[PDB]
Amino acid sequence: IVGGYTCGANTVPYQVSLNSGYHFCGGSLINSQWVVSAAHCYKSGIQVRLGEDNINVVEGNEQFISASKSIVHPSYNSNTLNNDIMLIKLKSAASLNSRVASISLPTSCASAGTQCLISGWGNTKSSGTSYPDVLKCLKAPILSDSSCKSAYPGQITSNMFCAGYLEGGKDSCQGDSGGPVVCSGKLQGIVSWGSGCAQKNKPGVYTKVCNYVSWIKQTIASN
Ligand SMILES: CC(=N)N1CC[C@H](Oc2ccc([C@H](Cc3ccc4ccc(C(=N)N)cc4c3)C(=O)O)cc2)C1
Ligand SMILES: [Ca+2]
């Protein structure tokens, strides 16, 4: 997260860290046995880390649970990043408490103007590389479809939305991938892609979760 602030230990209880020997992507806990992340975060041998703040120090509220199954969206296109969403089932259910909690799926799509909370352990520099050990947060508004499409000609689908600031300076970045975009208590986006990080006229692009609610519900009910 570039231009954000330190969230504070367990203030974003649904935030997960996907670990394969090291943190490589974020994710959101949607219930006690399921995690939602970006399809581009797909890997085998994933361990889901819940209740995390500092990812390099055992602080006491963590739950490390291995994934039993991963399901990439049937129409995911790795070249365009269309349908960049994936579900991960935990081998055992997480113990939900005040520090580890699920986030609600949306009942309707969010519109431009809505302020959301984006979080992750990704790169904090627009030019250069610096990865934080503790969770970073950023409040950012959802941008109009017109602005989004003007920024990325022919690359924005109905399954994507832009959020951030056209003036640059604040944005999610590499390492934040798969992480949550929560607006008014509902999971509306998943950190997907962008041209650089926090660059002028190059806002972050996120997966539009509201278009996948039925797929998510059906998949969980049958797996
Ligand atoms: C070629 C083209 N026009 N495309 C449009 C869709 C797709 O975009 C991508 C895919 C992977 C990357 C990563 C880099 C990359 C990876 C994750 C990111 C997460 C967030 C942000 C952000 N600024 N909010 C930027 C990221 C940039 C790479 O270079 O490998 C960057 C952009 C391909
Ligand atoms: Ca820790």
Tokens of 115: 């302020």
Approach to solving: X-ray
- Residue 15 assigned as binding residue: no
Tokens of 191: 């950190």
Cα angle 14, 98, 133; round to 5? 55
Q: Please, what are the domains in the chain?
A: 1-12+103-210 (2.40.10.10), 13-102+211-223 (2.40.10.10)
- Count Cβ atoms below 10 Å from residue 111 Cβ, excluding itself: 11
Which candidate in 28, 119, 177, 192 is catalytic?
177
CB under 8 Å to 13, separation ≥6 — which residues? 29, 51, 98, 99, 100, 101
Active site residue 95: no
CB contact at 8 A, 102 and 36: no
Strands 15-19 and 5-6, sheet pairing: unpaired
174 CB less than 6 Å from ligand 1? yes
Active site residue 84: yes
AA identity, residue 8: G
Q: What is the resolution of this structure in A?
A: 1.9
Ligand 1 center–CA 117 separation, angstroms: 20
Tokens of 70: 């991963």
CA distance 117 to 120: 10
Tokens of 25: 């992507």
CA-nearest residue, atom 11 of ligand 1: 193
CA-nearest residue, atom 25 of ligand 1: 194
Strands 47-50 and 15-19, sheet pairing: antiparallel
